[PDB]
Amino acid sequence: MLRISQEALTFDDVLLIPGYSEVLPKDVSLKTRLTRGIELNIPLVSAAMDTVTEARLAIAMAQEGGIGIIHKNMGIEQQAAEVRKVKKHETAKAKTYPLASKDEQGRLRVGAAVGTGADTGERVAALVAAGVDVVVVDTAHGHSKGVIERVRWVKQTFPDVQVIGGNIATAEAAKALAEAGADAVKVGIGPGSICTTRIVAGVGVPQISAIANVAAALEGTGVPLIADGGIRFSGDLAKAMVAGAYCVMMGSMFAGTEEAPGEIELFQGRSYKSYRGMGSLVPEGIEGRVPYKGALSAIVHQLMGGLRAAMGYTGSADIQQMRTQPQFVRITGAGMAESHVHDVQITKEAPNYR
Amino acid sequence: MLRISQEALTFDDVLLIPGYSEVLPKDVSLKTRLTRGIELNIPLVSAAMDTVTEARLAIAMAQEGGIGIIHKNMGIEQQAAEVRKVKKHETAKAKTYPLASKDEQGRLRVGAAVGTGADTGERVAALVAAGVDVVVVDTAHGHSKGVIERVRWVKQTFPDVQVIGGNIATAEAAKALAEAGADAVKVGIGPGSICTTRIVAGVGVPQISAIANVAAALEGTGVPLIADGGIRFSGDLAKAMVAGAYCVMMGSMFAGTEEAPGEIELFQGRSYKSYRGMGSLVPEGIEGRVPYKGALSAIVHQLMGGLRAAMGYTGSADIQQMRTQPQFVRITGAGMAESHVHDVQITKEAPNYR
Amino acid sequence: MLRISQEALTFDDVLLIPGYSEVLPKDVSLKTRLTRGIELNIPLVSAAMDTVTEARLAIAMAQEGGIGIIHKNMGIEQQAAEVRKVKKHETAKAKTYPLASKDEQGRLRVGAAVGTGADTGERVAALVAAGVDVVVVDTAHGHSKGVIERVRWVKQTFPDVQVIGGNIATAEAAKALAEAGADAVKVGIGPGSICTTRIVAGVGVPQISAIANVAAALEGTGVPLIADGGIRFSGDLAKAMVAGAYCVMMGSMFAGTEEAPGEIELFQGRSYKSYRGMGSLVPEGIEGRVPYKGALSAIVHQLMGGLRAAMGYTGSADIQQMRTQPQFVRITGAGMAESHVHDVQITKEAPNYR
Amino acid sequence: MLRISQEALTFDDVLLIPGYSEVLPKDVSLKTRLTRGIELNIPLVSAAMDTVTEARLAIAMAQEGGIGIIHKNMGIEQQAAEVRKVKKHETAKAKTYPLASKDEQGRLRVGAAVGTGADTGERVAALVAAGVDVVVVDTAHGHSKGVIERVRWVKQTFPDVQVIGGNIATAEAAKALAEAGADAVKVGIGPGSICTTRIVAGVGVPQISAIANVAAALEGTGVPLIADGGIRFSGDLAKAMVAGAYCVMMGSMFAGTEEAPGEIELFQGRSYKSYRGMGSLVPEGIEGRVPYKGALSAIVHQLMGGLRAAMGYTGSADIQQMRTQPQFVRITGAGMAESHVHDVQITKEAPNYR
Amino acid sequence: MLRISQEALTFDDVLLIPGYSEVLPKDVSLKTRLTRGIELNIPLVSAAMDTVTEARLAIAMAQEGGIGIIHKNMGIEQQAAEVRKVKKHETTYPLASKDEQGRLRVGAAVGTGADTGERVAALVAAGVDVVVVDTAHGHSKGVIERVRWVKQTFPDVQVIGGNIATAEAAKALAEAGADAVKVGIGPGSICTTRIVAGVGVPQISAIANVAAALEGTGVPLIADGGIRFSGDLAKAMVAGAYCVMMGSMFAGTEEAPGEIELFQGRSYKSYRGMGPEGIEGRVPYKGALSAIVHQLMGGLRAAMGYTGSADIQQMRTQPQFVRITGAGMAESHVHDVQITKEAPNYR
Ligand SMILES: O=c1[nH]cnc2c1ncn2[C@@H]1O[C@H](COP(=O)(O)O)[C@@H](O)[C@H]1O
Numbered sequence A, B, C, D: 001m002l003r004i005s006q007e008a009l010t011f012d013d014v015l016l017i018p019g020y021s022e023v024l025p026k027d028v029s030l031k032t033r034l035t036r037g038i039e040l041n042i043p044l045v046s047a048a049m050d051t052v053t054e055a056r057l058a059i060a061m062a063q064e065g066g067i068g069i070i071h072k073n074m075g076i077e078q079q080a081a082e083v084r085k086v087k088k089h090e091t092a093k094a095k096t097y098p099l100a101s102k103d104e105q106g107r108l109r110v111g112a113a114v115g116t117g118a119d120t121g122e123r124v125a126a127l128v129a130a131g132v133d134v135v136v137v138d139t140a141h142g143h144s145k146g147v148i149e150r151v152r153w154v155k156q157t158f159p160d161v162q163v164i165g166g167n168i169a170t171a172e173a174a175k176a177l178a179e180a181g182a183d184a185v186k187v188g189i190g191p192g193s194i195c196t197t198r199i200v201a202g203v204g205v206p207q208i209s210a211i212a213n214v215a216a217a218l219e220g221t222g223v224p225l226i227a228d229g230g231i232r233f234s235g236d237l238a239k240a241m242v243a244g245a246y247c248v249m250m251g252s253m254f255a256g257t258e259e260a261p262g263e264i265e266l267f268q269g270r271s272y273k274s275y276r277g278m279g280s281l282v283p284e285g286i287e288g289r290v291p292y293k294g295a296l297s298a299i300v301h302q303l304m305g306g307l308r309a310a311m312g313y314t315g316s317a318d319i320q321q322m323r324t325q326p327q328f329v330r331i332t333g334a335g336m337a338e339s340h341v342h343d344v345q346i347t348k349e350a351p352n353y354r
Numbered sequence E: 001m002l003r004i005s006q007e008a009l010t011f012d013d014v015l016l017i018p019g020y021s022e023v024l025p026k027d028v029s030l031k032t033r034l035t036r037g038i039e040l041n042i043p044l045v046s047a048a049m050d051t052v053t054e055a056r057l058a059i060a061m062a063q064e065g066g067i068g069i070i071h072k073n074m075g076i077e078q079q080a081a082e083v084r085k086v087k088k089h090e091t092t093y094p095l096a097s098k099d100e101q102g103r104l105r106v107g108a109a110v111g112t113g114a115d116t117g118e119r120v121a122a123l124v125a126a127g128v129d130v131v132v133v134d135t136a137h138g139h140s141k142g143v144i145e146r147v148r149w150v151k152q153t154f155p156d157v158q159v160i161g162g163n164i165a166t167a168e169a170a171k172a173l174a175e176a177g178a179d180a181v182k183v184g185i186g187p188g189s190i191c192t193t194r195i196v197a198g199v200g201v202p203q204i205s206a207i208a209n210v211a212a213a214l215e216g217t218g219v220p221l222i223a224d225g226g227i228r229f230s231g232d233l234a235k236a237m238v239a240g241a242y243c244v245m246m247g248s249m250f251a252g253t254e255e256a257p258g259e260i261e262l263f264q265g266r267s268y269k270s271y272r273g274m275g276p277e278g279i280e281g282r283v284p285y286k287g288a289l290s291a292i293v294h295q296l297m298g299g300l301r302a303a304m305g306y307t308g309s310a311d312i313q314q315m316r317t318q319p320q321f322v323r324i325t326g327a328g329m330a331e332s333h334v335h336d337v338q339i340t341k342e343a344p345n346y347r
């Protein structure tokens, strides 16, 4: 009697099956795309949130081979100034970043978020003049007249900039944004760590199924999809890629880095940095904090180490193979309990595990 | 070998799928029906419980555009006097309530509960003489000879009053109450926060399936169904509507408001009001308390904000569309864990989330 | 690739569906059978455990209309003396027990357990001479050469006594014990509260499926089945009956009564009595304690009140109808969470709920 | 849309069904094989981990009728010296070990692990010269060019030694190692108590399905499979055998024995020994400790008592029957809750249960 | 061998002894002095902290018959502007603290830093009633000299100096011309001075030692910090205080700076030390200031009823304490019963 379209799965519902391997984890390729026009050397994007990405973290993300999306919870002039900081940043003396995401002019790549409200035309124009590489039309519900028409307008008005539209969670939404001319789509309704959309509105799609449905819809187009939200462990990243993601966007994972906005807060013997939803104070997110994690480079190293391991296990030599060839098994709650550490009292944990 | 009719789902088993939207949350219509003859401007009913609805809260519910059902755990004269308080209440001076539920004479609408025991004939007569808009024949098991015959008797004896029968949880029960002449049916066996029917009797139907089964049964009749119990978050309300409910009845959500009976109780630095099952002291409910929530208006605002968001997400312009067009996905335990806030230490929560 | 016969369910996996009712809970019939030859006025049996049933509790069980099975963890003379105490017990003065389980001579009914070891022939003979109504050939694995041959031997050697064989959990086991001449079979491998068989041996069948499989096997024979173990709430009892049980055996529920062996133990402001597995100190059970519950009569009243409610809800006028006509829905973990009390801080609980 | 090969199960998803039994637990046979050429009197192997198996524990394992695999986290000379200790060990005076695993010369059997890195050729040669019975080519991903080629090389170079390859979790991996000439395959990707592969890489297969898939693949070959990891209770061992394992490898279960490396550590009134992953400090395991368990002989006695019970319950007279004839039921989370001790306050636990 | 001057006590070390009473709680007088020139109708002062007192709370404090001290963690123009907001505020408040021109009274804190001279000038120009030379260590050359400077340069303005905890410090500030002294080294809820520096004096003994030194000087003393219960306020008065300054008790009010934060079923507002020798936190939301004041003053009236003190002068000088042990304090609190409903004045 219920109108149920499908059962939908998320990360903890599935595991990757090992396959025959001849390429070691250290030798696989991690190169992928953010959009039709923008390549990334590693499949990582930092979230457009005011506790995650401003110039400092965006510089670091690009240096690592990913990219940062500067948040829009600031004045237009201020957001453009952040973009300019990234574009003008020069590599120091003796430091070298062989994987750095750079444009044709050799400048670090950066993105920036806009909405669909009254200041959007001016905001986009300012960001484009500041040299932004990609404009992210970023709302809670990308499958809407407002977002579709704004994506079209950016493509027409500023023909040399890349455009991402989101967020979405269905095949029909993916086709609608592709029809608007999006250079990539961003996938995720509700899975974010600090997000309460699924609880307050009762709306969303478990992220592994969301990713796969969007990936299938975009087959034949060459338009990338960005899997946004819900990543807690490096293994989730691997699963997202095999479900069809071209890259992943994370907020919580990066909010605790030195390069993220904010200062270290001490509490009960541990160190933290603040992390809050952008729809937080009828709110659809809350406010919190995450453990301090040190330099971004160390978090990236752990994440990519885990992804490289997964590619080693599945026998995937590069991202295109990882996206299209490995298989999942579906598991139960007991399968997941067995996956975690179990029946031993931990005394010393790992940087990549709790 | 087991006689199992179906797998049955409740709120946490499903999520709403986003759809194409052109109508903003602030612009959708929330109008619906309580019964064949009674319209509501918002789909909210307060429970007929002695810790939830007496005159003060019923006045407020009607002013907000919903309705209150005055409980029957009091003398007949006393219950009629509560009804009269609501009917005679006049709007103050400078306060205006544009959505107020009013009868043809401009008086605030109110309902009242009766059972099937010996004082029922007199109780109904007194409530009708007091100007009650709807008599709720309210028992633990509406699919029974007693309730069916009493619903018939009220329809025959007092032809100008609306009648609700309940509670039920099946298609055949819905048809039986409709055949008795009910102007609406009330759905819910066991899901109430303080209810222990499912534990003590082993009886009940998960509420999302209960709602959908009753909705399908009543197709072609124009008889509304009221989804009673189990609502914890505004997202549950959205799900109930898409499963086919015309409106929802809540007890726990309203027991903590200023307008509910009882005084604020202080305990471990927080404020509470009492909340107890009507089958509490072989009991089928227990006794407890819920956090103080302040004015009813603020709770209603949060609930309707969440419902408006859900309608925005599904592209539903009004309640009839919301009831009949959006789809669910079925999810697992991990899907639900991903829906809640996860993997972040909360520091500041939201009025609509914990 | 796995040899899996079926998915198997237990109590928390299912709920009873309400049906049309014309018979009130106070008016239904609870009469049933323990064995081909022994009627019970209520479907309750107390477990043959040394912390549950000796003469005092067996007397009370019979007086209530059920029956007690005296445990075998004592000398043969001692076990026979316990049986004699029950048979010789006379009702006091002004107390009357209208439902008492009595034999043709007007004496209270009682059962007693035996195993299959070396003292079994003498033990059975002593119990029969003491006037026992039913010999329970009681082992961990009733589907065995030893139990089958001992059941046959008792039927041949002592032709006037009833015989129960167990424990079993399959259709083929039920047919094998029926072929041995059992007057009833006892169902339950692993579900007992203090039992660790399923953990230590990895063996067992979820009890609702076990009951239904055995009930289907015994159709056409008139041989009762006794559902032994795993009952925690009165609702579980209702579910067991609808799955096909003729009656239920409980240990934990009765161990805390005044009539059970042992004295009240005080600990952290609460009162307890001891309760331990019979395979406890390679053990297959452990040792513990359960809350003190007062007179057995109060526990029976709560259990039967819950069963009467369930029969009222399903429209079952008597046990035969309850066993054969009502339906289940299968539920998820969220369905069960909704069944329990949820999202309210309990202040006063109920005798039948926690 | 997702590429899902199957639903996969682990231990807590299934239970063994009782069957007709004529052979008592004390009378069944536990004999099995480690490899084509090596018989074991009991189906137990100790893990090749530096907190589990060195000479002392390997001696004890062999004396009990199983075998130990000496770990490779030590110099080549040192690992060979450990092997020599086992081979040269003579039984004392008045102690007798009737089940001892011995080679043709009457010496205790022992295995040793190697990897695929640069020191492997020399390490294998040294272990073989030291008299090792079986070389375990042991890596995180046995389905790889490196492991396959190394297994071939050992078979060719040292034709008189047995070779195990692993770890694997699929049918195709099993066929690939069998084609390389492996004398047994070791099954397990991620289930180990201290392992974090499934979390960090997102890779693995629930162990009961892994075992069954490998068992089916190896039908017709006579090549044993060793079920490595995830065993927490003796019942898990029984389940592993019925899924098709020839024997099981355990680390956590043995790390707390007196014979394991390391000294007793006292903490909060209890005794512990250290236990850590071999991929612990991008780590794929962590570090911890497990309760002290005393002599290995007592743990073996409990494990085999549980397996004997399971064989008694299923009517399996020997390991070959246990592997091929009994059936499972699939269960839910509630089935598992019912399997554990429930609804009783434990006061005295058992050596084989918590 | 240790140079120990005395054993020192604080609030939980003592209890007030009941005495013969003829004046009911509702009939006692709560009037007192803030400074030798300024009178208050209730003995309450709000702390000069950026999470406690700005214009809004200061207005409410004055209206209740106490006074607020505007904090100095803001620009000079900003602080003077806060003072003017209070001085210009118009309304019934029968107990309201007002100056000779009928304007609400307000205080403002200064330090001894470089801009102090300018800050004082601006505040005085804004019509401030009292300048609080407010530092962690009032018994210092710097503070004593600044107090003297203010009394020279603007002798028309009342001056408070602090903080101090000894007889010698009290006499030094009185000599410098202070119109009141403020007592408290380390007892504040959020303060860590006693832990980080190892320095301080338990507040009851600090108050009593200062009160003895100031007998006959005409100089009132303000007991600043460590008040958790209304009973503490009563104790502080009997130990010799003329009034009490609180931060934590007021930070959770509607009138205090900041907004409500929700966390684990309760509501909170932020509270942090001005110093590090302090930490940062939050306190339960308590609603209107008027409610807190009512409870505090009800507790004080009850204590005065119990001791038979008809006014503040008697309360400061006549009642006695007993010294109690840890078991004595355990008996004083609720004990051996599971609370189900607590009280606004007892959590
Ligand atoms: O206030 C919010 N409500 C709903 N979603 C949010 C909010 N803030 C951030 N998000 C989403 O959550 C993602 C981050 O998820 P995370 O990596 O799981 O922490 C963002 O990239 C956004 O898509």
Ligand SMILES: O=c1[nH]cnc2c1ncn2[C@@H]1O[C@H](COP(=O)(O)O)[C@@H](O)[C@H]1O
Pocket (backbone or CB within 6 Å): B047, B048, B049, B167, B188, B190, B191, B192, B193, B194, B195, B196, B197, B228, B229, B230, B231, B249, B250, B251, B252, B253, B276, B277, B278, B279, B280, B284, B285, B286
């Ligand atoms: O004592 C009781 N037993 C069973 N159900 C109850 C009892 N009291 C109230 N209810 C039901 O529970 C609903 C309220 O559920 P809630 O909104 O989840 O708190 C009521 O409208 C009633 O249908």
Ligand SMILES: O=c1[nH]cnc2c1ncn2[C@@H]1O[C@H](COP(=O)(O)O)[C@@H](O)[C@H]1O
Pocket (backbone or CB within 6 Å): C047, C048, C049, C167, C188, C190, C191, C192, C193, C194, C195, C196, C197, C228, C229, C230, C231, C249, C250, C251, C252, C253, C276, C277, C278, C279, C280, C284, C285, C286
């Ligand atoms: O030591 C034991 N091991 C396994 N099962 C037991 C043991 N002791 C009692 N039982 C079973 O557990 C049942 C009682 O279960 P309960 O009503 O859930 O407490 C008994 O009637 C027996 O069938």
Ligand SMILES: O=c1[nH]cnc2c1ncn2[C@@H]1O[C@H](COP(=O)(O)O)[C@@H](O)[C@H]1O
Pocket (backbone or CB within 6 Å): D047, D048, D049, D167, D188, D190, D191, D192, D193, D194, D195, D196, D197, D228, D229, D230, D231, D249, D250, D251, D252, D253, D276, D277, D278, D279, D280, D284, D285, D286
């Ligand atoms: O650091 C590690 N990472 C992954 N797996 C490990 C690690 N260390 C040991 N294992 C595996 O875990 C098994 C032991 O699992 P256990 O019996 O569940 O404690 C070993 O035999 C190895 O197969």
Ligand SMILES: O=c1[nH]cnc2c1ncn2[C@@H]1O[C@H](COP(=O)(O)O)[C@@H](O)[C@H]1O
Pocket (backbone or CB within 6 Å): E047, E048, E049, E163, E184, E186, E187, E188, E189, E190, E191, E192, E193, E224, E225, E226, E227, E245, E246, E247, E248, E249, E272, E273, E274, E275, E277, E278, E279
């Ligand atoms: O950072 C700080 N260090 C030391 N003392 C402080 C600090 N902040 C405030 N105080 C003091 O603590 C008092 C407030 O104490 P409370 O009433 O116990 O919360 C203030 O009036 C100040 O005297």
